[PDB]
């Protein structure tokens, strides 16, 4: 079982992108299966578009098409690549102190932003081309300043004073309307309107010092998912206190990094699961949590009650 | 330590077959020892009969007699072999969409079944010639968990079992060919059907959340049924008649990403003086042997009355020695 | 992931110093962060004062101010340095057979002590100027092997000789105010704490069940608890509010057993029981414990001062990442 | 902590030779301390004489002197070296199908024995020059036949039908008078007299299938210790049922191979250990068990009561 180096969903949360020290793999979420794999070598970042057989490979930057098994182009950077995100219009590569913006169609360079250092490789992109924005932190060389950069016209739009301390995680909704950020102490969540900059929502989490790792919106932006180092995942409703919580089984490895993504509500069959969770079918919002130890976890929450969420399944990546 | 690709007991559970990336090995169970080995190359499938020095080897089909060190015959197929099972009467080869049946004696081809694709290479075959039966899944081209009961003696299907709503994940047949147990890909419900009539006899619930199942195996006396899954835990269901009767927990050090196959042996006498079971000097303990894909063997004991969590006595290594 | 050769807290326990084979790093504890780092070379001793941007760096002795990025001084020694400690008044450098004491401000040499060889580089420094004491072991030169010398840094004259243990001393620790001293023999079975001004042994603790090595000892800020870590991969807490260890810290099973582990005890803080099912008032004070190991991980625990017992683990970071 | 590859006592049981994937180490037993170490490379076989600064090095054969830091000689063999043993007069190298015998002084080759294949690299050699005997199994090409070879005159002396099954472990006492064997069943231990060949003692062990790994004689030959895969070590008295037993603590790793060596009886201080085992001092026979995980253990047995033995210390090798 080779060690993995990168794990991430796609822009819709219906796939798993995973790259090991020996190769990379592409999974699925509801009809679980191994769509693709190559045992080429160590891969540090494997990012995928909205399916469409498009991938970006970063060695432990190359763009490949898995259907045609060809290589579109290769680009080098003076420093190590820290993060890559994509939408249907723009390609952005983030480095230690520079942000590169590319046209996803032509591959031509469009603009380069000189930013203050980002050791954590933090950026967030709106995946919809209707409101194509880019947000990145602006530390002073006034700590949690986030630069709302408009990729459509290649000009910044406004600067938001998000938090007094360092920003830990940022995410943009699917429609590109809202932005959410979390401070380095990981106790307060702030959600901003990217158009005006007003603070709309504030959430409490992490009663003790548990750092926040990842934040993700649902497809309809109804729910917000935050994963930290406490092996517990909180759910906040964008309709204060958390709405629902996820408790991973204790037997799991604790030396893991966990991300999450919330999908559209689906129907689950009671007869399939006799012991737990026992109306043949109920509407339950699916939550998918993948950890670096190589396991995909599926949880479901009742849209009215909330509370601690059951685990329907636990599948094994890398096998 | 070479990577191993295949582990299977014999049809009686008294031997161990195994295949590495460099060759294959054959062990024994009660007087543990390495009967045979061969450093040829990558072996994917190593199947053995009831001892008798007959082997089937599939590289990563050739049948070899190990006592004579000779080759009986070699059979080629258009596609890769996914499973091979034997009894003392018939030889069965499964491809992803085709099933081949051979006579073990004369080795002439007897039948061929064109089946819907089986990417998992699932099968269950009765090892006794008195009740020689073959069962394989029949997915459509909700009618997903249909299993075809095929009689090997006359080479004709007998009945169609509407086993499960979803795809079948694992299937096994008792030693006498009387019963069959299947499980869906969710691994939450274990069902047992009588192959003679087709009526469902037993239905067991396994675990709480849906997790993958690796293999199912009956006892030699058909008293208990063993299931192994991704939970790093092995459950035992008592068929003397729901919830599992007794469960097997591997040591916490064991890697969780390991394939595990198990087998249940006949009850034998153990000394309670040496082992503080927590007392008569000796009581009959049912032995269970569990081998993992990392290369270790585990010996447990089960109390037919008490059941519960089973104590572990010893542990070996199958790689090296 | 480069190998790390040295980890220690500051004299207050709110910071982290660390030395790799490629450089050194400085962290923080409550609002966790990386204050400083340089990829200069191999570092074996990285000791810091009470913040104040003052460091002692020994290659695999140089005093560097991290805020100014300048060099206060550079001093050489005939042999390799084994330990360095500071308070806001004095600086101590220990070689295998010699002890050098420097004034922290003027940096001129004040005293030199010729001691019997200490290959283990063991000392203990009181961080308060009111009770500035240094203690070092004095074994006979080749039963009375565990003799330790209580040395006063203020007047540069020894005060008394303590017959600590029968065997060689393995670890020493002085409380924040310089009132108490704790010692550990090479067998690690008995922990003894002495009152430095009077010399009487106040408390005696039994550690574990069998003899095993001890890595380090450290007091709490308020001298309420004493923390010892040993090769059994278990950390014990002894309550000095007054035998058997009061509370025990069990690291996760997946952790390597061959890890140097140092710990520290912080002041009690308010934690929300709604988030953490301790097993209930919304908030209760729980003493936080930070345990950093040589593999490069930090572990946060909480102890209930009344209940004590086995401690729950809240979170785990990863130093060097 | 680099993985170790080889553990062995010296011919007297007062020293520890250990080989890592990075180098080799030489420990001591009663004043436990690190005598020597070298970070040269992987070593698979490290054998030491009765102190005397003599070592045998086999790569993962070189004879080196640790005090002079020089090499005595280097000899190669057609096949991989399986085992090496020494006394004060002879040097023995065993391959799969051959046994090489050397004069430890002149380094000249003396004799070569053609044997049936021994994949386990099994032997037993008498450490005393007065009765210098060598034994090695002789399987057919009648399974447990062992050839008693006289190293003094370089001629075999007698053949004993030890066991009906394959031989698993052999050991010879310090004075070279007695011999011990164990079959692959691990249930029967038989002790032979080399002079005559008669079966002297027979001991019962291993009620279930636990293979026997190593057998060792005490210095006075009063006790015989056998170690298996069951995490338990039994003690037999050469004055049926085992005399005493060693139970390692449960928290230890189970993927361990333990060897043992019983030393001369010594006195222990009861005051040093208040928490366990509570006369100021009493005579107790020390037993040393080192495992492949890197831990050394010291047990003590009361020569009259026997029974389960207490554990005094657990020191961490390799650290």
Keywords, separated by commas or semicolons:
part of a larger assembly; 4 chains; mainly beta; five-stranded mixed β-sheet; five-stranded antiparallel β-sheet; 30 strands; globular; membrane protein; autophagy; membrane remodeling; PIP binding; PI3P
Separation of the first and last Cα atoms of chain A: 8 Å
Order of helices and strands of chain A: EEEEEEEEEEEEEEEEEEEEEEEEEEEEEE
Strand order of the largest sheet of chain A: 21-22-23-24-29
Number of DSSP helices of chain A? 0
The level of helicity of chain A is under 10%
Q: In oligomeric terms, what are we looking at?
A: part of a larger assembly
PDB class: membrane protein
Keywords: autophagy, PIP binding, PI3P, PI(3, 5)P2, lipid binding protein, membrane protein
Entry title: Tube assembly of Atg18-WT
Chains A, B, C, D: Autophagy-related protein 18
Describe the structure.
Chains A, D: This is Autophagy-related protein 18. Chains A, D: GO terms for molecular function: phosphatidylinositol-3,5-bisphosphate binding; phosphatidylinositol-3-phosphate binding; phosphatidylinositol-4-phosphate binding; protein-macromolecule adaptor activity; ubiquitin binding. Chains A, D: Its main location: membrane. Chains A, D: Belongs to the WD repeat PROPPIN family. This is part of a larger assembly, with four copies of chain A. Chain A is an all-beta fold and 319 residues long. In chain A, a hairpin with a 5-residue loop joins strand 11 and strand 12 (109-114). Chain A is globular. In chain A, strands 21-22-23-24-29 form a five-stranded mixed sheet, with no helix packed on it. The first copy, chain A, is built from no helices and 30 strands. Chain A binds chain C through residues 119, 165-166, 184-185, 206-211, 228-230, 232, 253-255, and chain C through 30-34, 252, 254, 271-272, 274-276, 297, 300, 313-318.
